[PDB]
Write a protein that binds this ligand. Structure first.
Ligand SMILES: [Cl-]
Ligand SMILES: [Cl-]
Lengths: 160, 160
């Protein structure tokens, strides 16, 4: 409450500000591990609340970007496997979660559809390759129509 | 420098703390638009530096999660298009960037490979469907080997 009082106040305010600066710094440097601890006094309660709120967020967002890194990893893996013909490989969707998992599942099902059209073609053409000319290629939509009529083309030939 | 001085110091420190709390709050609520402005005094310079550093980060991370939202969008679109047979559709990789763009390109090329094996099959089977038995299905790796030998199967039949 004198001059020494005012100086001391500032010395303290300065320090409070300093640890807060340290926390925000270990937040920019991905160290969301250390909780800020208790506020030093009433005047900083809200700030510290926002500090935790900011931590909880910086955390989630980090997890999500991570997932996305696993996704690009598994996709890469799946691509490698498929070029080599190991077409039963898929991005391990289970290991992922959230947005990343959805994307992963989308990719697997998208390829699955394409692969299915081949399993059929490979089939009703295997039969055609050994006499049986009974089966027909499934009617396919849009530009996949070709496949359906190219298999029908070879069906006429063999027939007769 | 008296009692009124100490009180005033605290009134100020309290306020400084308050705006800082407001900034960190509009950072948790995705409002990374407002720069903190200048520090109120030396003791808060570093803290404000970390405040900007934290803003620049919260920004980037938001952009990335966004990209990932476009990605899941385009993938969805591509899936819709393909089920309907519009197999020339692709995730618009250009509109994206960073990790998301890479993933998008991966997905497009992964499907492209699968589609290519079909373009060939549809071809060397169209020929087989109209007399020509000269062309051969390309030797394929792993489990795609089937396709290559199922087309060879029907090649023998037609031949002779
Ligand atoms: Cl291999
Ligand atoms: Cl349509």
């Amino acid at each position: 409450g004198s001059h020494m009082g005012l100086f001391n106040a500032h010395a303290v305010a300065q320090q409070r500000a300093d640890r807060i600066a340290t926390l925000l710094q270990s937040f920019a440097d991905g160290q969301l591990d250390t909780a800020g601890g208790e506020a030093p006094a009433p005047g900083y309660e809200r700030l510290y609340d926002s500090l935790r709120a900011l931590q909880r967020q910086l955390r989630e967002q980090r997890a999500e970007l991570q997932q996305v890194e696993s996704l690009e990893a598994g996709l890469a893996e799946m691509s490698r496997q498929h070029e080599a013909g190991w077409i039963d490989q898929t991005i391990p969707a289970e290991r992922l979660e959230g947005r990343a998992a959805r994307i992963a599942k989308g990719v697997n099902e998208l390829v699955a559809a394409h692969i299915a059209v081949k399993m059929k073609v490979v089939s009703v053409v295997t039969a055609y390759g050994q006499g049986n000319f009974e089966p027909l290629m499934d009617r396919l939509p849009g530009k996949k129509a070709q496949i359906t009529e190219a298999i029908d083309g070879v069906r006429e030939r063999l027939r007769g």
